[PDB]
Design a protein around this ligand. Sequence first.
Ligand code: MG
Ligand code: MG
Lengths: 565, 564
Amino acid sequence: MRTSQYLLSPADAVVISHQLLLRAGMIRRLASGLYTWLPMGLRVLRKVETIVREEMNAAGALEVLMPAVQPAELWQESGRWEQYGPELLRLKDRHEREFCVGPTHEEVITDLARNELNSYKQLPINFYQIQTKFRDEIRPRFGLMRGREFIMKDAYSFHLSQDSLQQTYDGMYQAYSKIFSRLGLDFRPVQADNGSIGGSGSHEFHVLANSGEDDIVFSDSSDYAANIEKAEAVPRESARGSATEDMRLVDTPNTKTIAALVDGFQLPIEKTIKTLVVHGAEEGTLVALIVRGDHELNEIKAANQPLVASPLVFASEAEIRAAIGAGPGSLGPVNLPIACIVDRSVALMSDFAAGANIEDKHYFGVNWERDLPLPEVADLRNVVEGDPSPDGKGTLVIKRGIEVGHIFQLGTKYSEAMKLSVLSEQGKPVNLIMGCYGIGVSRVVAAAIEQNHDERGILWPSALAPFQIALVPLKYETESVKQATDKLYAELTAAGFEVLLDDRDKKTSPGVKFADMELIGIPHRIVISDRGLSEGVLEYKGRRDSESQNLPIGELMSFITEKLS
Amino acid sequence: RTSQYLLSPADAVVISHQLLLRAGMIRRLASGLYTWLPMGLRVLRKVETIVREEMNAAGALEVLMPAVQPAELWQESGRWEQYGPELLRLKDRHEREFCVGPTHEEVITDLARNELNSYKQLPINFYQIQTKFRDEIRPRFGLMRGREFIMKDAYSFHLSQDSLQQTYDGMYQAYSKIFSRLGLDFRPVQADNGSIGGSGSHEFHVLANSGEDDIVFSDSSDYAANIEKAEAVPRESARGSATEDMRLVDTPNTKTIAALVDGFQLPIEKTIKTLVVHGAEEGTLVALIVRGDHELNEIKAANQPLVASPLVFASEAEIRAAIGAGPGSLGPVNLPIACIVDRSVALMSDFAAGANIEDKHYFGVNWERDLPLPEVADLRNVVEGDPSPDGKGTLVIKRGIEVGHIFQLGTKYSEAMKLSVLSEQGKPVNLIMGCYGIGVSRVVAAAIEQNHDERGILWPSALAPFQIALVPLKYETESVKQATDKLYAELTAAGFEVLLDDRDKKTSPGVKFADMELIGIPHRIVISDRGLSEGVLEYKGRRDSESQNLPIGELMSFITEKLS
Ligand SMILES: [Mg+2]
Ligand SMILES: [Mg+2]
C-alpha cells in the first residue's frame, strides 16, 4: 500500500532544493519558515540524524536533551537576553515569567555544568543534543536553508586547559569529516572568523554548490582553505613603485567614484583608493580605512583592528564632514585629521589618486613618504581570484559554499559570566574553557539536493535515499503480476532493502509512475509486467541510467545486491 | 564511563521524581522544564523506539510538525481562545501571532486539506513523536505534570465511521503491544467520550497508588472504566412502600447531609443532595439530585441534554432568586425549576429534603404520592462495592496513571476547517478523525511509580539504561584493569549495554554498588584481584539478596541466560 500512502496528494521557491523538496512531497509549508516533514521527507531526515549521532558517540560525546523554552534570567546572565537582537523569539507564560524559544543553548548547558560539573576528574566532557531551535530570521527563505524552526546538532565541551580543549576540538573536526563523508557530500572544511587577527580555532564545514551564500577560498595547490571573511590577503606586487609624477590638485566636481576616475580620467584602477570612515573603538573617535579601487573592505578584518569599533559602524556624512572638512567623494589620506589604516596592497601604490579632503578635488600623483607618511598597514581587503596563496603555495580560487557545520573555541565567555568554576587538581579555581560544535541537520537535507539534482529530480547520496528500490507494476491488478510483485517485495525486504511499492491503479500512467520515482530520488527501479513474466524476465533501470534493462528473474536478487554494494 | 555518565532533593514529593533526580536521569531548568541527562535520555529513547515500532507495524506514517504554530489555524477551530491559559502564546518580530503547541489537531487537519484529495488515499493515520508545551498552572510531580513533555500524537482520517473503528481498534491493539513491551502492569479502561453511553474513548493506565485517576473494575468481569465514565446502577431492585406521611420540619441549623443525619437521627440513605446547575437553554437552571452518601459525577451531569456543558454551578444569588430559598434548604418538592434525579434517588422512600423554604425540611417524602417523579439519569460516581453494570460482580476502585488515550473525534475539525473529500460515488464527505496519544515523557515516570524498592529504581527489562555494570574493585591495579577491559569488550561485542565503573579508590566499593542499584542496572559483575586468583568473577542481580562467585568461562553463558 506504499505509494498510495507515502506520495500523499510552487510559486515562490527559487532555490532548487526547496522546489524539489516541495514537489517530491518531502516537506510542506505551515507558516513563514515553518515546514512539516512529510513521511518521505522524515525518512531522509532520520538517516542524517543516525549518522551524526553515531559519529558524536564514537567521538566520546554524551547525548542529552535540553528544553526548547528557556528562562530569560539565564539569557540575562550572559547579557544575550538583550544583545541577541530581534532573532530571539521571546514570550511570557501565564504567570508573566519571561522565556525565549532557544536558538542555541550556551546558557542552559553552562547552567547544567554549574550544577553537574564539580570535580576535575569529570573533565573533559562533551555534551550534545539533536533538538529543534527557533530563530526569528527577518526574511525566512530558501526552504530548509534559512527557515525559522530547524533541527540542529549542537554540542558543548568543557575543559580545564587550552590543550584539553584543542584535543576535543580536533576530534570534532575529525568526526564532522566522517559525518559529511558518510553523508556522501562534496564538502570542504575551511578556516573561519575567530574574532581575532590571525590565530585559529574556528572552522566551518561547507557543501560546494553554485547557490552557496558563502564565498570560500582555496589554494590551487596547497591545503589552504578559508572563508573569505578569514582568508589572509597578501599583495601581488613585491615592492612599492617609484615616484614618477608630482602631486597636484585636480578639479573633480563630478568625479566621486572609482568608476568616474577610471572611465572619466582614464586612471588605471590600481591607481585609485576607497576611503571608508568607520567609528573608533575609542568612543567618539573616527578611523579611516583605505583599500585599493579594485578591492573591497573586509568588514570582519576591519572590526578586528584594535582602533576600530567592533561591531563595525560606518560614519555618517555629517560626521565625516564635521571631522574632515569635506564629504564622501573627496576624501583621502592627505591632511586627514583622523587616524588612518591602509591595506597592505595600498602601501605599495605609487603615483596614485586620492580625494584631497577638499570638496570637489583630488590629488593625482600621490606618493607615500614623499607627499605624506605611510600610516599603519593591515590586511583590510577581501582576497580576489588569482591572489597569491597566503602560505606561499599557489594562487587562490574562490568557490561558493553552503555552511553545514561550525566548530568554535569559545574560551571562558560564559563560564566567567555565569560563574562556572572547578578546582584544578592542584587546588586552583579554573573557569571552564568551552567549545561549541554545531551541524545544521535540517540544512543538510537541502544542501545535498543543491549539490545533487538533475532534470529528472532529486539525486540522493546513497545514505540519504528514502528508499533503495521502487517496484512499479504495470497492470498490478493482474493476478500473474500481483503475485510476482508481492513476492518480490517480500524477497527484497527480507534481504534488508528498503522498497517502495507503487500500488497506484491504472488511473496513474506508467510514465508518470516512472517520473515520480525519479523525482523523489529512488536510486533503482524495477518494473514487472505480464509480457516480461511470460518471457521470464524483469525490467530494471537505474536513477542515473539512460536505458532500461531486462534481467532473468533468477539473476535479479544477485544483481540488485551488487548495485547496492 | 561512569566518570562521565553519573555527573555529581527538596520540592520532590512523588517517588519517580525523587528517583529521576537522584539517579541523574533529569534535572530541573525551570518550573515544569526538565533536561534529560545522559543516563535519562537512554531510557527515553528505549521508550520511543518501542512506540515507533508499534506505530509503524500498525500502518501509521511518521511525520514531524512544527512546534510554533500560527494563531490563524487555532482561530479556525476557536481553540485560540477556547483552549485557555494553558496555551502558550507569543508574537514574532513581525507581530504575527503563534502558540507553542500543546497538540496538533489544527496543523494536521491543515496538512490534510492540502494532501488528502482522493478517497483512494484513505484511510490514513499520521503520527509524530514531538515535544509539546502545556502551560500547567501548577507544574508538579516531575515528568508527570511538566510543561514541556514528549508525546506521540497520532491522527487518522476516514470516509466512514466503520473505517475509523477499524483503525481505532488497531491503535487499541498497538497500545497494548506497546505497554506490554514496556513491562508495565497497565489496564485499558472505558473513558469519557462526550456522550451518554456509547464507546469510542479508551484510556490506558499504569496501576500505581500515586495515580491521580480513579479507575473502576469488576472483581468478576473484564469491565474497566475511568470513574468519570463508570455506569452506576442502584443496589436496590425496587422503590419502597410509603410508611410515613410527609411533614414540614424546622431545620434552623441543618444545611449539610451530616447535620440532617446527626441532628435528626435520619439514616444517610434517606437524605439527598440538590446541586443547582446552569441549563443549556440560556438563562435556565437545572437541579441535580443524588443521595446523601453519593457525589455528583460532573462528566455525567454535563452530558445531560438539559445541562450546560461544560458544567457551571449556580450562584447562591441565582438559587435564591429562582427558588426562594438558599443552599441547605433545597429539594424537589415545590421546585420551580427543572429537576433530574439519580437512579438511586428514584428508589428512595420516606426521605428528607430541604423544603425550598429557608430553614425547613420535608420528612417522609414519597415519590408519586407527594410529588411526581422527575426525569431519571445516571448522575452519581460509583462507589466501592457497587454492582458491576455488565451484571458480572461488584466494583472496585483503584488508582491509575494515564499513559495513553485514544479518541474518536468525528468531524469536529474537518467541519470547521472545511476538510472534505469526494466519496467513490461523488458525494462530498467531511473526514472523520480519530486521535491517539501516548505520554512518552510520562511513561518513564509511571514506570518508576510502579517499580522501585528501598535501594532505588527498578526498571522493566526494556527500559534499563544499561544491562550490566562492571565494578572493578581496585581498578588502578593493572591486573584488574586488564581483565575488566577484556570483559567490557567481550560483553559489548556480544551486544550487551555495559556501564564500566571507572571511578577510583576515592568512591568506595559500597558507594559504587549503591549507585548502580539506584540507577536500576539489572546485573552487576565485580572484578577483583581476590577472585582473579581463584579464576572467578563475582555476580549479583539487582533484585537478589546475596552475591555469588562464578567461574570466568561460565560467565558469558551465565549472563546471556540471565537476560533471556
Ligand atoms: Mg558564516
Ligand atoms: Mg481524564
